[PDB]
Amino acid sequence: FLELSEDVEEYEDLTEIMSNVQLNSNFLALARELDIMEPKVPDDIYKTHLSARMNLASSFVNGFVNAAFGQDKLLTDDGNKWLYKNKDHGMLSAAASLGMILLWDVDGGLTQIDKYLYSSEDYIKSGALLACGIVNSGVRNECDPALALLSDYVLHNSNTMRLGSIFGLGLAYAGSNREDVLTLLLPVMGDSKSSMEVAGVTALACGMIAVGSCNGDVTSTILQTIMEKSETELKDTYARWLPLGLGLNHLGKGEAIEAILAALEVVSEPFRSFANTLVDVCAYAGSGNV
């Protein structure tokens, strides 16, 4: 999104078409003109002519097929029944798949997710928040409903709710580089109560928001969080998102990565050798550096 002033002519249409407001309308219109609108069932994708996780995968692939469409009664009419039948951790992913179906569909998606927002299960609530984030992802909005919708959940004490809200805000403000979103999510990065993977998801959201921006405060927060976290618990299985955020923030820049790696040199080898390589390759992507 290019943030400019209204002094230019037809600024409303310019910012709308930059915001991709008519993206969804045109995409649905062309899908209908191709007759490619019917919701394709994961079952007849599977060709069943001849289980909780398998059903979860079926829901996910249904969401993938019907993504950006917002036309799927399988999770709309009996969606509550499907999530209730679902087991353990998959209700969040099912709601996120519904948001995938409704992505780029701001108006319809928000209304059809408002009912699931007040769901009982924490997983369903977090999935609904992530669905909202997916819906507003990519497409820009004048009033930006995601920032207001994710108000308590942004720093909510519950790990799953906070994770859903954080991933949603990351997907929404991805490329927005919004100062307000950054100044609201980086303090959430600074939280110590959140788990290691929660901090990793915060780093991922910050990186996808400030991708290719060289956001110095984001980098400093990343490094400070890495330092404050002890190395033994750092290098287990989930700190691999902080270097990813660094690489996103310095994407396509190069050269200056020497300062970042010198700052990171204090880290122990098992994670430093991974993180510096990751951030270097992400910064030098699309260059052909033999």
């Binding site: 108006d107 319809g108 928000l110 209304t111 408002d114 009912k115 007040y118 909005n141 004048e142 009033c143 930006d144 409903p145 995601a146 920032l147 207001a148 919708l149 108000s151 307000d180």
Partner: protein, 85 residues
């Protein structure tokens, strides 16, 4: 002495450019007045209706949105289900 102001309310693919004014003795349109207009037009109760402006959450019923920064050309998002008691 009507304090008219233009707001673009959007919900459920449906958009209205409403010229709303303060009605309950306030010098400027407020959350109470906007909620009353929304309830008259649709009927969503103030408990579960969600008005979103500039990504700022509406939680206080007495906060003046005119002071919060609504001007002409501003757009707001309405979230909820149209209830027909």
């Amino acid at each position: 002495a009507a304090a008219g102001l233009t707001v673009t309310v959007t919900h459920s693919n449906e958009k209205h450019d409403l010229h709303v004014t303060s009605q309950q003795g306030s010098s400027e349109p407020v959350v109470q007045d906007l909620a009353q207009v929304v309830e008259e037009v649709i009927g969503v109760p103030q408990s579960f209706q969600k008005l979103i402006f500039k990504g700022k959450s509406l939680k206080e019923m007495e906060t003046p949105l005119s002071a919060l920064g609504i001007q002409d050309g501003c757009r707001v998002m309405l979230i909820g289900k149209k209830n027909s008691p």
